[model samples]
Target: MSELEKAMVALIDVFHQYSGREGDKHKLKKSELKELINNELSHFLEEIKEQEVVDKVMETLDEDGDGECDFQEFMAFVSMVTTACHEFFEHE
Candidate 1:
């Protein structure tokens, strides 16, 4: 596979690592999202250390009002983080 394709596959793998843990197996609940960010995106994002932080992030990401992050929402989040990172350093 191409490098970009590999990265996409890796993202899916990472998503499931947390998404499958509780509640809906195909979506990320609040706690699952928090844990995924804290553990997986440690370098790109700040750790979710408080309930308020998680709640605020969930409010922004839960665009469908489902109280959970499906794959598309997770992809949106990754894009947002990547954009912010690009602004900071011009590259990943």
Candidate 2:
């Protein structure tokens, strides 16, 4: 898989593990997903240090404007953020 796909999978794993929702394959609720992204992914955010950019990406991913994200949206968000990081860090 590409780095973006790998990153999304990793994020899904994190959400499942951290939210005590292990074994669930469905997309999490929007609030839950945002919490996981904001809190659990602190390390990633710290590395990026671009809150506005992150928020913009999240807004784009939350296409419904419902302040929540579905599976497809979450995957898209992960792909975008991962691509940005790869570009910023010069990842191969």
Candidate 3:
């Protein structure tokens, strides 16, 4: 994999590590996930309007429509956001 790919994969790993699994999805509470982003991943979050995107992603992934995400849903969310980041930074 390219360095970018590796980096993204590592990022996913870190996210999973911080957030518990909900079956195939991540099971982090919204507040916990937000705290993780604000603390551990703050620099990366600052690179984009991550909070808004995160809110939208959370809504999309809350399969039960409970306003929270499970593992698979969170994975999908991360995948999309990472793709966006890759596109944004590709030329940098």
Candidate 1 regions exceeding 4 Å error are 87-92
Q: How would you encode candidate 2's per-residue C-alpha lDDT over 1-92 as one tens digit per residue?
A: 58999977887776567656634456556446546666666665654345566567567677678665656676676676677664556554
Per-residue lDDT of 1-92 in model 3, one digit per residue for the tens? 58999988887787666664434233667777666666755544564365777686457556678666666666676666676665566566
Model 1 alpha-carbon miss at residue 25, Å: 2.0
- Give the winner by TM-score: 1
The whole-model C-alpha lDDT of candidate 3 against the native structure comes to 0.63
Residue pairs clashing in model 2 are none
How does candidate 1 fare on TM-score?
0.74
The CA lDDT at 59 in model 2 is 73
Q: What is the C-alpha lDDT of each candidate?
A: 0.72, 0.63, 0.63
RMSD of each: 2.7, 5.8, 5.6
What candidate 2 gets wrong by more than 4 Å, as runs, is: 1-25, 47-57, 87-92
**Per-candidate TM-score against the hidden true structure:** 0.74, 0.47, 0.48
Give the least accurate 10-residue stretch of model 3, judged by summed lDDT.
18-27
- Write candidate 1's Cα lDDT for 21-88 as tens digits: 76687666666666677765678766567788778877876678886677888788867786777555
